Coordinates of C-alpha atoms in Angstrom, one line a residue:
Chain A
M1 CA 12.2 7.3 -14.3
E2 CA 10.0 6.6 -17.3
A3 CA 6.3 6.0 -17.8
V4 CA 5.0 2.6 -19.2
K5 CA 2.5 2.9 -22.0
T6 CA 0.6 0.0 -23.7
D7 CA -2.7 -0.4 -25.5
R8 CA -2.8 -4.0 -24.2
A9 CA -4.3 -2.6 -20.9
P10 CA -6.7 0.2 -20.0
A11 CA -5.3 3.6 -21.0
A12 CA -4.2 5.9 -18.1
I13 CA -6.5 8.8 -18.8
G14 CA -5.8 11.2 -15.9
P15 CA -2.9 12.2 -13.6
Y16 CA -1.3 8.7 -13.5
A17 CA 0.6 6.2 -15.6
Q18 CA -0.1 2.5 -16.0
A19 CA 3.2 1.9 -14.4
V20 CA 6.5 3.7 -13.8
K21 CA 10.1 2.4 -14.2
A22 CA 12.5 3.7 -11.5
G23 CA 15.4 2.7 -9.3
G24 CA 15.4 -0.9 -10.5
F25 CA 11.7 -1.5 -9.9
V26 CA 8.4 -1.2 -11.7
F27 CA 5.5 0.4 -9.9
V28 CA 2.2 -0.7 -11.4
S29 CA -1.0 1.2 -10.8
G30 CA -4.0 -0.4 -9.3
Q31 CA -5.7 -2.6 -11.9
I32 CA -9.4 -3.1 -12.4
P33 CA -11.6 -5.4 -14.6
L34 CA -11.5 -3.2 -17.8
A35 CA -10.6 -4.7 -21.2
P36 CA -8.1 -2.5 -23.1
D37 CA -10.9 -0.6 -24.9
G38 CA -12.2 0.8 -21.7
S39 CA -15.2 -1.5 -21.4
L40 CA -16.2 -2.9 -18.0
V41 CA -15.9 -6.8 -17.7
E42 CA -18.5 -7.9 -15.4
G43 CA -19.1 -11.1 -13.5
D44 CA -18.3 -13.0 -10.3
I45 CA -14.8 -12.6 -8.6
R46 CA -13.2 -15.2 -11.0
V47 CA -14.1 -13.4 -14.2
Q48 CA -13.1 -9.9 -12.9
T49 CA -10.0 -11.1 -11.3
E50 CA -8.9 -12.8 -14.5
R51 CA -9.1 -9.5 -16.4
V52 CA -7.3 -7.7 -13.6
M53 CA -4.5 -10.4 -13.9
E54 CA -4.2 -9.9 -17.7
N55 CA -3.9 -6.2 -17.3
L56 CA -1.0 -6.7 -14.8
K57 CA 0.6 -9.1 -17.2
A58 CA 0.2 -6.6 -20.1
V59 CA 1.6 -3.6 -18.1
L60 CA 4.5 -5.6 -16.7
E61 CA 5.6 -7.0 -20.1
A62 CA 5.2 -3.6 -21.8
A63 CA 7.8 -2.4 -19.1
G64 CA 10.3 -5.1 -20.0
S65 CA 9.3 -7.1 -16.9
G66 CA 6.8 -9.8 -16.1
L67 CA 4.6 -11.7 -13.7
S68 CA 7.4 -13.9 -12.5
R69 CA 9.4 -10.7 -11.3
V70 CA 6.6 -9.3 -9.1
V71 CA 7.8 -9.0 -5.5
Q72 CA 4.9 -7.4 -3.9
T73 CA 1.1 -7.0 -4.6
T74 CA -1.5 -5.1 -2.7
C75 CA -5.0 -6.6 -3.3
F76 CA -8.2 -4.8 -2.4
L77 CA -11.5 -6.7 -2.6
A78 CA -15.1 -5.2 -2.3
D79 CA -16.1 -8.3 -0.1
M80 CA -13.9 -10.7 1.8
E81 CA -16.4 -13.4 0.7
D82 CA -14.9 -13.1 -2.7
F83 CA -11.4 -14.1 -1.5
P84 CA -11.5 -17.9 -2.5
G85 CA -12.4 -17.2 -6.1
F86 CA -9.9 -14.3 -6.2
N87 CA -7.1 -16.5 -4.7
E88 CA -7.8 -19.3 -7.1
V89 CA -7.4 -17.0 -10.1
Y90 CA -4.4 -15.1 -8.5
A91 CA -2.7 -18.5 -8.1
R92 CA -2.7 -19.0 -11.8
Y93 CA -0.5 -16.1 -12.8
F94 CA 2.2 -16.1 -10.1
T95 CA 5.1 -18.4 -9.8
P96 CA 7.6 -19.5 -7.0
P97 CA 9.0 -17.5 -5.4
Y98 CA 5.5 -15.9 -5.1
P99 CA 5.3 -12.2 -4.3
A100 CA 4.7 -10.7 -0.8
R101 CA 1.0 -9.9 -0.4
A102 CA -1.4 -7.9 1.6
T103 CA -5.1 -8.3 1.1
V104 CA -8.0 -6.3 2.6
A105 CA -11.6 -5.6 2.0
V106 CA -12.4 -1.9 1.4
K107 CA -15.7 0.1 1.5
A108 CA -15.8 0.6 -2.4
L109 CA -13.5 0.5 -5.5
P110 CA -13.3 2.6 -8.6
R111 CA -16.4 2.1 -10.6
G112 CA -18.1 -0.5 -8.2
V113 CA -15.5 -3.1 -9.3
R114 CA -15.0 -6.0 -7.0
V115 CA -11.2 -6.2 -7.2
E116 CA -8.2 -3.9 -7.6
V117 CA -4.6 -5.1 -7.6
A118 CA -1.5 -3.0 -7.6
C119 CA 1.9 -4.5 -7.5
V120 CA 5.7 -3.8 -7.6
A121 CA 8.2 -5.8 -9.6
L122 CA 11.8 -6.0 -10.5
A123 CA 12.7 -4.6 -13.9
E124 CA 15.6 -6.0 -16.2
Chain B
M1 CA 14.6 -12.5 -5.9
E2 CA 14.3 -14.9 -3.0
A3 CA 11.4 -16.0 -0.9
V4 CA 11.8 -15.9 2.8
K5 CA 10.7 -19.0 4.7
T6 CA 10.7 -19.2 8.5
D7 CA 8.7 -21.5 10.8
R8 CA 8.8 -18.8 13.6
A9 CA 5.9 -17.2 11.9
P10 CA 2.7 -18.3 10.1
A11 CA 3.7 -20.4 7.1
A12 CA 2.6 -18.9 3.8
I13 CA 0.1 -21.4 2.7
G14 CA -1.0 -20.3 -0.8
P15 CA 0.2 -18.1 -3.8
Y16 CA 2.6 -15.9 -1.7
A17 CA 5.8 -15.8 0.3
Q18 CA 6.0 -14.5 3.9
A19 CA 8.5 -12.0 2.3
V20 CA 10.8 -11.6 -0.7
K21 CA 14.3 -10.2 -0.8
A22 CA 14.9 -8.1 -3.9
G23 CA 16.7 -4.9 -5.2
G24 CA 18.2 -4.3 -1.8
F25 CA 14.9 -4.5 0.0
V26 CA 12.7 -7.0 1.8
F27 CA 9.0 -6.9 1.0
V28 CA 7.0 -8.4 3.9
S29 CA 3.5 -9.9 3.5
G30 CA 0.7 -8.5 5.5
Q31 CA 0.8 -10.2 9.0
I32 CA -2.1 -11.1 11.0
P33 CA -2.8 -12.4 14.6
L34 CA -1.8 -15.9 14.0
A35 CA 0.7 -17.9 16.0
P36 CA 3.3 -19.9 14.0
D37 CA 1.2 -23.2 14.2
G38 CA -1.7 -21.3 12.4
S39 CA -4.0 -20.8 15.3
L40 CA -6.0 -17.7 15.8
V41 CA -5.0 -15.4 18.7
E42 CA -8.0 -13.5 19.9
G43 CA -8.3 -10.6 22.2
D44 CA -8.3 -6.8 22.1
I45 CA -5.9 -4.9 19.8
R46 CA -3.1 -5.0 22.2
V47 CA -3.0 -8.8 22.3
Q48 CA -3.5 -9.2 18.5
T49 CA -1.2 -6.3 17.6
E50 CA 1.5 -7.9 19.7
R51 CA 1.2 -11.1 17.7
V52 CA 1.3 -9.4 14.4
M53 CA 4.5 -7.5 15.7
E54 CA 6.2 -10.8 16.7
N55 CA 5.4 -12.2 13.3
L56 CA 7.0 -9.2 11.5
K57 CA 10.0 -9.6 13.7
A58 CA 10.4 -13.3 12.9
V59 CA 9.9 -12.8 9.1
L60 CA 12.3 -9.8 9.0
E61 CA 14.9 -11.6 10.9
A62 CA 14.8 -14.7 8.8
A63 CA 15.3 -12.3 5.7
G64 CA 18.6 -11.3 7.3
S65 CA 17.2 -7.9 8.2
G66 CA 15.2 -6.7 11.3
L67 CA 12.7 -4.3 12.8
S68 CA 15.2 -1.4 13.0
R69 CA 15.6 -1.6 9.3
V70 CA 12.0 -1.1 8.4
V71 CA 11.5 2.0 6.2
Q72 CA 7.6 1.6 5.5
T73 CA 4.6 0.0 7.0
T74 CA 1.0 -0.2 5.7
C75 CA -1.3 -0.6 8.7
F76 CA -4.9 -1.8 8.3
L77 CA -7.3 -1.8 11.2
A78 CA -10.9 -3.1 11.4
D79 CA -11.8 -0.2 13.5
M80 CA -10.2 3.2 14.1
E81 CA -11.2 3.1 17.8
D82 CA -8.5 0.5 18.1
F83 CA -5.6 2.9 17.0
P84 CA -4.6 3.9 20.6
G85 CA -4.0 0.3 21.6
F86 CA -2.5 -0.5 18.2
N87 CA -0.1 2.4 18.2
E88 CA 1.0 1.6 21.8
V89 CA 2.2 -1.9 21.0
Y90 CA 3.6 -0.7 17.7
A91 CA 5.8 1.9 19.4
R92 CA 7.4 -0.9 21.4
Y93 CA 9.0 -2.6 18.3
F94 CA 10.0 0.3 16.2
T95 CA 13.1 2.5 16.7
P96 CA 14.3 6.0 15.5
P97 CA 14.4 6.7 12.6
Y98 CA 10.9 5.4 12.7
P99 CA 9.3 3.8 9.6
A100 CA 7.2 6.0 7.3
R101 CA 3.6 4.9 8.0
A102 CA 0.1 4.9 6.5
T103 CA -2.8 3.8 8.7
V104 CA -6.4 3.1 7.7
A105 CA -9.6 1.4 8.8
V106 CA -10.9 -1.1 6.3
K107 CA -14.2 -2.9 5.9
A108 CA -12.7 -6.4 6.8
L109 CA -9.4 -8.3 7.2
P110 CA -8.5 -11.9 6.6
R111 CA -10.1 -14.3 9.0
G112 CA -12.2 -11.7 10.8
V113 CA -8.9 -10.3 12.4
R114 CA -8.7 -6.7 13.6
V115 CA -5.2 -5.7 12.5
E116 CA -3.0 -6.4 9.5
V117 CA 0.4 -4.8 8.9
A118 CA 2.7 -5.1 5.7
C119 CA 6.1 -3.4 5.6
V120 CA 9.2 -2.8 3.5
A121 CA 12.6 -2.9 5.1
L122 CA 16.3 -2.6 3.9
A123 CA 18.1 -5.8 3.3
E124 CA 21.6 -6.0 5.0
Chain C
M1 CA 18.5 5.0 6.3
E2 CA 17.6 8.6 7.4
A3 CA 14.5 10.0 8.7
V4 CA 13.1 13.3 7.3
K5 CA 11.9 16.1 9.5
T6 CA 10.4 19.5 8.7
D7 CA 8.2 22.3 10.1
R8 CA 6.5 22.8 6.8
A9 CA 4.3 19.8 7.4
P10 CA 2.5 18.1 10.4
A11 CA 5.2 17.1 12.9
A12 CA 5.5 13.4 13.4
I13 CA 4.3 12.9 17.0
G14 CA 4.5 9.2 17.4
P15 CA 6.4 6.0 16.4
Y16 CA 6.7 7.2 12.7
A17 CA 8.8 9.7 10.6
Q18 CA 7.3 12.0 8.0
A19 CA 9.4 10.1 5.6
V20 CA 12.4 7.9 5.4
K21 CA 15.3 8.1 2.9
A22 CA 16.7 4.6 2.0
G23 CA 18.0 2.6 -0.8
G24 CA 17.6 5.4 -3.3
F25 CA 13.9 6.1 -2.6
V26 CA 12.0 8.3 -0.3
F27 CA 9.1 6.6 1.6
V28 CA 6.5 9.2 2.7
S29 CA 4.0 8.6 5.4
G30 CA 0.3 8.9 4.8
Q31 CA -0.5 12.6 4.8
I32 CA -3.9 14.0 6.0
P33 CA -5.5 17.5 5.9
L34 CA -3.4 18.9 9.0
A35 CA -1.7 22.3 8.8
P36 CA 1.9 22.4 10.1
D37 CA 0.8 23.7 13.5
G38 CA -1.3 20.6 14.0
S39 CA -4.7 22.0 13.4
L40 CA -7.3 20.3 11.2
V41 CA -8.1 21.8 7.9
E42 CA -11.9 21.2 7.2
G43 CA -14.0 21.4 4.1
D44 CA -14.9 19.5 1.0
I45 CA -12.4 17.2 -0.8
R46 CA -10.8 20.1 -2.7
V47 CA -9.9 21.9 0.4
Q48 CA -8.5 18.9 2.3
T49 CA -6.9 17.2 -0.8
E50 CA -5.0 20.4 -1.3
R51 CA -3.6 20.6 2.2
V52 CA -2.6 16.9 1.8
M53 CA -0.8 17.8 -1.5
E54 CA 1.1 20.8 0.2
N55 CA 2.1 18.4 3.0
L56 CA 3.4 15.8 0.5
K57 CA 5.3 18.6 -1.2
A58 CA 7.0 19.9 1.9
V59 CA 8.1 16.4 3.1
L60 CA 9.5 15.4 -0.3
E61 CA 11.4 18.7 -0.7
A62 CA 12.8 18.3 2.9
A63 CA 13.9 14.9 1.7
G64 CA 15.9 16.2 -1.3
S65 CA 13.4 15.3 -4.0
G66 CA 9.9 16.6 -5.1
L67 CA 6.5 16.0 -6.5
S68 CA 8.1 15.5 -9.9
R69 CA 10.1 12.5 -8.6
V70 CA 7.1 10.6 -7.2
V71 CA 6.8 7.2 -8.7
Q72 CA 3.9 5.6 -6.6
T73 CA 1.0 6.9 -4.5
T74 CA -1.7 5.1 -2.5
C75 CA -4.7 7.2 -2.1
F76 CA -7.3 6.4 0.5
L77 CA -10.7 8.3 0.4
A78 CA -13.5 8.1 3.0
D79 CA -16.2 8.3 0.2
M80 CA -15.7 7.3 -3.4
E81 CA -18.0 10.1 -4.4
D82 CA -15.2 12.6 -3.4
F83 CA -12.9 11.1 -6.1
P84 CA -13.5 13.8 -8.9
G85 CA -12.6 16.7 -6.6
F86 CA -9.6 14.8 -5.2
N87 CA -8.5 13.9 -8.7
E88 CA -8.9 17.5 -9.9
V89 CA -6.6 18.8 -7.1
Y90 CA -4.3 15.8 -7.4
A91 CA -3.6 16.7 -11.1
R92 CA -2.4 20.1 -10.1
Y93 CA 0.8 18.8 -8.4
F94 CA 1.9 15.9 -10.3
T95 CA 3.7 16.0 -13.7
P96 CA 4.3 13.7 -16.7
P97 CA 5.5 11.0 -16.3
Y98 CA 2.7 10.7 -13.7
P99 CA 3.2 8.4 -10.7
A100 CA 1.6 4.8 -10.6
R101 CA -1.5 5.2 -8.5
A102 CA -3.9 3.0 -6.5
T103 CA -7.1 4.6 -5.3
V104 CA -9.6 3.1 -2.9
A105 CA -12.4 4.1 -0.4
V106 CA -11.9 2.8 3.1
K107 CA -14.1 2.7 6.2
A108 CA -12.4 5.6 8.1
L109 CA -9.3 7.6 8.2
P110 CA -7.2 9.1 11.1
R111 CA -9.3 11.9 12.7
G112 CA -12.4 11.5 10.6
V113 CA -10.6 13.0 7.7
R114 CA -11.6 12.3 4.1
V115 CA -8.3 11.9 2.3
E116 CA -4.9 10.3 3.1
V117 CA -2.2 10.0 0.6
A118 CA 1.1 8.1 1.0
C119 CA 3.8 7.9 -1.7
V120 CA 7.2 6.7 -2.7
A121 CA 9.6 8.8 -4.6
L122 CA 13.1 8.8 -6.1
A123 CA 15.7 10.5 -4.0
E124 CA 17.7 13.3 -5.9

């Protein structure tokens, strides 16, 4: 069990790690639209989702894994209306065999953001 | 890694797999009230939860696993008033040792459905 | 695959187990502010979050692990405003390397509660 640390994604300031390596898997914390320097990337679903995706990418690689190794993702949206644009961008970063997915619209997300994505992947 | 593909459950049309086998586990995508052909199955929770259950059964089986091997489920409902009905049907398909569970009411689910359930089971 | 059972945490009355030991991990059910006897602990986030933590703790120990072995947690809040209080009490129980975390605000939780935390830990 070892924490994943990288300045390529938003720093984990608080009681959590960007990701954890354990038992053969990598557990990545929910990711939101924040550039590495903490700033809040704003825009429609497409813009925010892209930032979310890059963070995942950064966290996974830093852990010696990657997007192609993600087996499960949990996607929370602020509004189901935003699904299409979210899916279109989501489609860009994942590859066959795609990960198992669960998507739901929640009441609200950290910092009024529109999308948060957490996932689990295989390590190496 | 291996994507699970069965026609006895809604086909995964998009950037995801009905489920993926990896690290000794099976990660099943959130299942909703849809018959294998893709059609919406309407009705109260019981009718919908039964469809979701059948879908899980089909996917898990195709992965060379099953309902008795499920260790965790993430249950999302569109309204907590529906828990009683949901739980009733749910108890039919699971067996001791029962899966660990987390249940919540969310703002909205895919295609206006009222129940979505994702799970993790042991591969055989 | 083995279910975890303990009196130091709300008994699992239903189709689920407080936790399941499988494939090297411990899958813990979503815990809410219920004292072991089944009564509801009421108050602000701090008071309820604390019961939840104590619950998680009792279950993980009964499983053969602990709060220090937790790699992932899914935290559901009823109101996002409650986050700070929840985070302040969350930080008391977890230790570096902290778990991967995903936090979101949902429409409602079991029994009108304001916090539900589920997690996955390494078995010892």
